[PDB]
């Protein structure tokens, strides 16, 4: 048992396998336009 794990990790690294304790998602690129903004603005004033 305990010695078999110390040699397993060396095998899995050769194929890029990892144990299920060590997996997560990734992040996408982004859209083709900038992020929108809330209803906050100035108010028109005379010269």
């Amino acid at each position: 048992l305990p010695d078999v794990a110390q040699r397993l990790m060396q095998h899995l690294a050769e194929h890029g396998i990892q144990p299920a304790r060590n997996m997560a998602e990734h992040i996408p690129p982004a859209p083709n336009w900038p992020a929108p903004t809330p209803p906050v603005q100035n108010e028109q004033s005379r010269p």
Binding site: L1, V4, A5, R7, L8, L12, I17, P19, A20, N22
Partner: protein, 65 residues
């Protein structure tokens, strides 16, 4: 008819994966130790690699001595 020598104890297949229902007293016990899950054992692309290790570096007689 005939069977393996250095292996044969392990129940794994390239279509379905390791046989959890009948797994060896060492097999599942390592999988729970290094951190592997039953999903990877049923993965024809991950379980294959995990099995190829036992076929060369595990072995029920090889781990005994």
């Amino acid at each position: 008819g005939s069977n393996f020598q250095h292996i044969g104890h392990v129940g794994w297949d390239p279509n379905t994966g390791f046989d959890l229902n009948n797994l060896d007293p060492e097999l599942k016990n390592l999988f729970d130790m290094c951190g592997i899950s039953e999903a990877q054992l049923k993965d024809r692309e991950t379980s294959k690699v995990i099995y190829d290790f036992i076929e060369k570096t595990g072995g029920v007689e090889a781990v005994k001595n």
